[PDB]
């Protein structure tokens, strides 16, 4: 995010970082359960990618987090790789996450809920702070 600010660590406890095999960040995702993560379909997640939970900083020689293996990926069959429509994917953990003050789930809406134009919402991530 460009023009955002640093979060209080632990304050967005559902936020996860997806890491490839080399081992570095290629997308974020969100915990909905101790067993599942929602992310975008275009991220191209595979079973060799790893989910990282409880993480604040990316340069620690070592920090206290949770690296979770992926058992199966559920891309939405409606996903259109040209149009980018129906951009969601579910990740089924092969080892439930261990909820705590820093790792927990976000709530999911209903299909009939209304989120009106004008609502002040919040987005988080580790993407670039400047193009």
């Amino acid at each position: 995010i460009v023009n955002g600010e640093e979060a209080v660590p632990g304050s967005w406890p559902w936020q996860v970082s997806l890491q490839d095999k080399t081992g570095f960040h290629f997308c974020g995702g969100s915990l909905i359960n101790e067993n599942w993560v929602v992310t975008a379909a275009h991220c191209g997640v595979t079973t060799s990618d790893v989910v990282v939970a409880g993480e604040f900083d990316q340069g620690s020689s070592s920090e206290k987090i949770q690296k979770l293996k992926i058992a199966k990926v559920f891309k939405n069959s409606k996903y259109n790789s040209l149009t980018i429509n129906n951009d969601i994917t579910l990740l089924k953990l092969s080892t439930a996450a261990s909820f705590s003050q820093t790792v927990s789930a976000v709530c999911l809406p209903s299909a009939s809920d209304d989120f009106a134009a004008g609502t002040t919402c919040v987005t988080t991530g580790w993407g670039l702070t400047r193009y």
């Binding site: 967005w12 974020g28 995702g29 709530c107 919040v122 987005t123």
Partner: peptide
């Protein structure tokens, strides 16, 4: 403000009934 490279797949949340609810997933 704007989401940028590396923010893909993360959440866009809004507060409902005092709880954060996922409304969006960073897409493009």
């Amino acid at each position: 403000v704007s989401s940028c490279m590396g923010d893909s797949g993360g959440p866009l949340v809004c507060k409902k009934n005092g709880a954060w609810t996922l409304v969006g997933i960073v897409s493009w």
